[PDB]
Amino acid sequence: MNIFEMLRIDEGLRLKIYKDTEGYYTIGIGHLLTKSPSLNAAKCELDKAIGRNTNGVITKDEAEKLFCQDVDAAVRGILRNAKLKPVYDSLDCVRRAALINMVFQMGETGVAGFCNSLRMLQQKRWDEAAVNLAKSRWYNQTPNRAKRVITTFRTGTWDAYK
Ligand SMILES: [Cl-]
Ligand code: NA
């Protein structure tokens, strides 16, 4: 069990363009295509991201390649961010996955704005971090996923993904 398996559980897999929980055109394993309401714009982004004329449908291999790149981009966003890197560096491998999961879902800037939660995580105040992380739009809008990620921070185990 690892960051790829964890996000595959949380994001699912769709080979045709769908809308994410915010209503944004998405494909694959949670690959955001655009925030524009135009499905044509989403199709351009898809074709640009895949390197061929897709007409809104990709293969599982293409979805997994986007997923590889997206996980890498989440880690890169963490490592380049002055607020996120010290937290990441302080965490064990399982909790690092939980932080990557948040960045994959919400982006570097959004997660870097959890300033109190980030301090509690760095100080290994797990129960207090868990309570603070739930005081968020994130928890309220996607509570089942947030609960799994928070449980991962609270326990340092994969128990919520079993
Ligand atoms: Cl959810
Ligand atoms: Na939707």
Side-chain angles (χ1 to χ4, degrees), residues 51-65:
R52 74 185 173 80
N53 197 324
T54 70
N55 198 29
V57 165
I58 60 173
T59 70
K60 182 166 190 269
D61 286 337
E62 286 165 346
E64 298 182 322
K65 177 135 190 213

Side-chain angles (χ1 to χ4, degrees), residues 18-24:
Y18 64 102
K19 290 187 182 171
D20 74 4
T21 64
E22 299 293 334
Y24 293 136

